Amino acid sequence: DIQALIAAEITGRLPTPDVYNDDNKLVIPAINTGGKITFSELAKTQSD
Amino acid sequence: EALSGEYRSLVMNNPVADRDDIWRNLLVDGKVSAEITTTLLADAIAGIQLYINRTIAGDEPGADSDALERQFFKDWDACNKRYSTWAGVSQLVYYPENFVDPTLRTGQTGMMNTMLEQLSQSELNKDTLENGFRQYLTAFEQVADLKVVSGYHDTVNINQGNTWFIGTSQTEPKKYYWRKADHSKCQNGRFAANAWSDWKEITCAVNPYGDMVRPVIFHSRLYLLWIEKQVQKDNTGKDTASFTLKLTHVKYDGSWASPFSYDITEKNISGWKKTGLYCAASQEDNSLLIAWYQIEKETQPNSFGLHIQPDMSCKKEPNIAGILATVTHQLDTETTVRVNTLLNRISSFEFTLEKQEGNKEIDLVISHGDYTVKTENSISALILNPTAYINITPYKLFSDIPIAQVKTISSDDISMEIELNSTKFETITGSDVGLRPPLYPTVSRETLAFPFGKLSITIPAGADINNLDCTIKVRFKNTDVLAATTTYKLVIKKTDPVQKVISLYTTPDGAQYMEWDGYRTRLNTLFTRQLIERANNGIDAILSPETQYLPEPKPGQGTYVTLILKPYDKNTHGTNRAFTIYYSNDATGSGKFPVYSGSLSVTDNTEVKLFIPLIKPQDTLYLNATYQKEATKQILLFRTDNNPEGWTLDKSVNNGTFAGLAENGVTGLLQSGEPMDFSGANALYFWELFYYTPMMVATRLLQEQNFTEANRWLSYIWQPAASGAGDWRVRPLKEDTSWNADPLDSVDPDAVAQNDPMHYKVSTLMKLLDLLIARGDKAYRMQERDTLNEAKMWYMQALGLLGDKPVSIFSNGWENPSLSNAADKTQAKQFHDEISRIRSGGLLPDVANTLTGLFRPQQNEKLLGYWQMLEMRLFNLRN
Amino acid sequence: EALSGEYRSLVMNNPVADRDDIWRNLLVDGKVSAEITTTLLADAIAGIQLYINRTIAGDEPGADSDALERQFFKDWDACNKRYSTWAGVSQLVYYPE
Amino acid sequence: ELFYYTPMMVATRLLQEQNFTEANRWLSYIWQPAASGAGDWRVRPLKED
Amino acid sequence: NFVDPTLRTGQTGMMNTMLEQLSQSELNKDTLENGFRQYLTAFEQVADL
Amino acid sequence: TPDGAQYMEWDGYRTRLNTLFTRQLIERANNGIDAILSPETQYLPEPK
Amino acid sequence: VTLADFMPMSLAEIRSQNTGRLSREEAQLLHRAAQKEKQNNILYTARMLTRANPLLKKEMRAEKFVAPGAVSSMFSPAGYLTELYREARGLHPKDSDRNLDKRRQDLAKLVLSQDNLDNEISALSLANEQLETALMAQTGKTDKNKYYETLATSRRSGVTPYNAPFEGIHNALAQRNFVLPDNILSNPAKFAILAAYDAGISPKLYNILTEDTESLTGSDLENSLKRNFPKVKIKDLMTLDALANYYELPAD
Amino acid sequence: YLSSAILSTSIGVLDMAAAAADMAPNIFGVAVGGSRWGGIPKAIGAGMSLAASATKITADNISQSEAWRRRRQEWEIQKNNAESEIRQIDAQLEALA
Amino acid sequence: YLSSAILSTSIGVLDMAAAAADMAPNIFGVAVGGSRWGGIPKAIGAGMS
């Protein structure tokens, strides 16, 4: 059940409804070999 | 309905078409009601299945017949037609334990059959459970005591074909049995354990004289053959002795025919002493050459022959001392026993595949079915195969009736014209066959066949038979408009493969072995001479691992050698990680025999142990190795005395190292005895006795709910160890011993699990899980308090056995590929190519991402059933 | 549930542990419902039985192998594993009738 | 008998008792669908009436 | 409409005994092949006459 | 005939009595029912 | 490499490709070698995968194991469909009119996703989508509603003159058990058309059935046949099965 | 039945030893002879007939035990019938109360 | 039961080979003889049984 949350957050649309609202970054996990969860973040410029 | 009408009116351009033609043309049913719901993959599957059925039943003309003649479609209806049976068959390579039934197994011996018969009642108390095992053990002892009397090798090259053996029992009267050793499962002088058949009894009453029994394969059928001596008395006081040759064979139902008999006594075999008989089939003039000959130090001072036609009629061979003269390497002597092979052809035929082919559109290749030479003429059987595919220009292309060519009758179109030394003789098929292969089935790439009936081609005359008998060529011509010719050359030449001898021995301490070209194969086992003392302590002592480590005399004269080798170094081993180690005698240039092949390890010493036989009769022996780089230098192994285990460690001036072992570890040179073999000739009997019998009795007590005894019988196989891992009490499981080299030639789980006994480990643990869950359920239905605690105990034990539930990843590297990107041929070729590279150890892996290609391996749904059952029962217990 | 979480956080020093590890380490099941009633000797018995099973199946490493190779544990599954068959086997010397 | 009446008997005898995947195997000793239009009769006297 | 693949007039004793041995309910490949090997033994004998 | 065939020869015809099918079936029969019942078994030749 | 390319092929395919290069016995040896290598490779992978058995983890490449019913599982309907497609897409030549890809162009684009494998759709809706994507490709129009509007007046088959809107009206209206020509509120002078709509008859079907075909001759009859049978040839329609399939009525 | 089948297969040894003993001549003197040439084939046949008899005996044994197992299954069904009828009659008594 | 019936019919061969072997004289010397004249009818009967 926690894996369902993690999976729907990594591929689906979670957190509902929007994301990325943390100082123009984004941190999304990445699970592998069934026994770890690693992280990899995004960034952006000051457009608009 | 409206869309379908307009579809076939506009797109299909055939408004009168039925609406089912939309179904057949578009692979979707439109006449369904609005409630029939299916997934989308399932609809694609149903569509492609309908398509494959219609194209395999001919309703979709123009299919690739070559593709339809392919294993996937050949196994279409049986396996691949429905998802159910496709999945069930595909899982059988990976989870055979799901389908292994411990009671019913293919190739189950008659002993195990009769034991299962006697355990098939409901009252299995210790008395019946021990009587059954004592009876099984009596039968096992009898089939283990069999000593091989004589053999006969099927083909003429002793590296191919089968070797039939005749074994006798250590009783009185003797009972004769027969096996078969398939040499097509024999690399490096090492028979796969499944290259051997079961010992099967000869029910006829065979009462040989002086141990003269011979198997022989006459028209693919096993014949037995022995000489029977019977004491008589003349009318006068003199008391003679009459001899009879007896001959029988297996019928199709495995019974033995009533033996024919031929009176043999003619004034001379009565006079011999220590005679022996010979028997071999003939590739020319299908008959049986039988021959009894006198034995001395040398073979055959005198010998009488006999020929037998398939009507089983005597025809005395008048001059056989000349025929036995060529095969004297297969004949017995006063001290050796040699198996016979079939008779060589006097003249070996060879067919150059082509000289010229003419029109390079029709392949027009022939194939000489049978070929031989009679007393004066060479007969042959020929079949001719053209292409006859699409693009015969111009087109119509409506109908084929079976400016352009002949679409009509194809009479006398093909013809063979053999060219003799100076002459030629031209036969056309209009003179042979009334059957004509029609150009219809016009559908493309269908090839045809033109069979010729036993062309007794006359006549080779004025030619030296057979010294300069190489006829120039054999040429034929599919003469037709736009059609061609090809020609073949007949290269008959008299040959003589000499002294390829294959013999049987028996060491003074009991061991037998068949010694062929440069190897030795142990035939019998001395296990029963030592089991006899264990057997008085009971089943617990018969089935304990100390019984399975019992030693065995070494086959003949030779040494065991335990070669230890260094890990893979790219410099000394070349690029490929595989290695094969040879031995020789060695008159360097006398040929060396590959005695072991393997994949040399990385970051670890690999230890290969062998038995190097002494066949040459300072007994020299020279071991090599062969890598991708080059073949290393020999290593002398010799001895000074006649010690049987004495073979000099670290022989003379040579360095004593290949440069691949480069350590002080070579020796293993003592130990006149090796352990009992679980992948040799008698592998089946040992595996039955030590694994398949306890598993059968345990699964047979689990059913009928004898849990405290089912556990006792499983604890003959596996028993939990105080350390982490379990204690496997079956030797070939403890040291994973593959004993089925070719397991995918049949849809059976036991072959796979024999090829990889880790599946027998998993099957055993699954039976144990069954047992624990059943004890838990039994105690859980007696609903009182202490029994509920006991049930929770049994379930907790099963959980501890299973371990930790494997978490199922869903955020995985599985993208969502399209069907076309998932069904590529490059996708399968790359996968299998990398596997075949990493399997021959071409180099180390890439380091290590993908093992099974695009689709991931699945967890055993049976194990998940165990997990779920335990969680459910434990939930109900806790609540 | 709360006590078990805090137990493996503080005592076992392994907060990520499963709650069944408390069962295996403490020989008592906590996931039972509040209606499961047992006596106190019976709970001690079930605890020592779970302990002996786990140490005889190797899940409790470091056991005395010499002690495990002893008649009581050699006849473990057949006789001494359950009170039923221990009592029934012990009575057989005294009341064979 | 050997070439027609035996496979037909074994096929009708497996159809009864509902062994379909083997009844089909035994009928495919007689008739077998061809990639061309007409079926492939694998019994010679039927193939040539 | 009336041909019964099992019962036929003039059916040989060989075919009779094979149908006899296929008349049980468990027709696995083992019995189905043993029956045919036995039929084939009898057939071989009546063909060698 | 010397090669096995029998025949009853009456006024001006010959009727073959036996068959040599079993001398050739014996080799097909080792490959199994699938080889015994295949059409190649049914086209087997016969001496005249 | 070599023996890996001949694993999927059959003996006839091997014999048929490089007819000049491979002999008829070399081809058979190569086919046997390919099948044996395929079997050995499958055994190799299965043996390395059975080391990761949860029951044998106490005695120990455990890379990825997916749950049963996952679309990425090698035993799932997605793997079955991949096998079916790989083996079936090459049965007819690509130019042939029976080729699988050419007759179902949506298969090669089909994405093997868990949502495709799991989500239930109506089979009839899928049939209708399949027919629409072809009919609109023929007509050239991409709008669905504009296409049905052109479909509402056309007479190019015995089932075609149908209105999506009128059929909706009629069904919705007969679901109220409402009878049009029995309204107090109507034009009693329009009872004919009202009872026609009550029986359920498109306006175009009414225009069809009210023509005066009886006693209509000359080039006018030619006009009328070209109007009422625009796509079918009358002689090809003459037969009984054709009449039963054109009007979607039983032949008997 | 099991003891009978085992006795029936443990007699081929004796029947063949009898034939092997009969193969030796028993008439001596000016006329010698008396062996029984067909003794050994006859004894192999007699052993076959005993194996066939014991095979039918063990088949009857299995059939018997299976008949008893099907009997016990019928009995379990009947016991469940009556056991559920008890629950139904108790619910009926509660409705009456 | 099937294996039993097959064993019971696969023994006439042995029972007839025994009679054919018994047809040969076993008493030699000044008095010759010892054949069993009824061996073959008896063995045919035993095979029938």
Author numbering:
A (entry chain E): 292 to 339
B (entry chain A): 921 to 1322, 1447 to 1661, 1674 to 1903, 1906 to 1937
C (entry chain E): 921 to 1017
D (entry chain B): 1744 to 1792
E (entry chain B): 1018 to 1066
F (entry chain B): 1551 to 1598
G (entry chain A): 21 to 80, 100 to 291
H (entry chain D): 2083 to 2179
What did the authors write?
The ~1.4 MDa TcA is a homo-pentameric bell-shaped molecule that mediates target cell association, membrane penetration, and toxin translocation. Cryo-EM structures of Mm-TcdA4 and Xn-XptA1 in complex with heparin reveal that the glycan interacts with different parts of the shell domain, including receptor-binding domains.
We chose Mm-TcdA4 from the opportunistic human pathogen M. morganii to investigate the heparin/HS-toxin interaction in more detail. Since synthetic heparins/HSs are difficult to produce in the large amounts needed for biophysical and structural studies, we decided to work with natural ~15 kDa porcine intestinal mucosa heparin instead, regardless of its heterogeneity. We obtained BLI curves that show a rapid, concentration-dependent signal increase upon association and a signal decrease upon dissociation, indicating the tight interaction of Mm-TcdA4 and heparin. To identify which domains of Mm-TcdA4 are involved in heparin/HS binding, we determined the structure of Mm-TcdA4 in complex with porcine intestinal mucosa heparin using single particle cryo-EM. However, we identified additional densities at the periphery of the shell domain of each protomer. The density occupies a cleft that is predominantly formed by positively charged residues (R194, R195, K243, K265, R266, and R886), representing an ideal binding site for negatively charged heparins. This shows that unexpectedly heparins do not interact with an RBD or the neuraminidase-like domain at the tip of the shell, but directly with the α-helical domain of the shell. The heparin/HS binding site in the α-helical shell domain of Mm-TcdA4 is 10 nm away from the membrane if the Tc toxin is in the prepore conformation and attaches perpendicularly to the membrane.
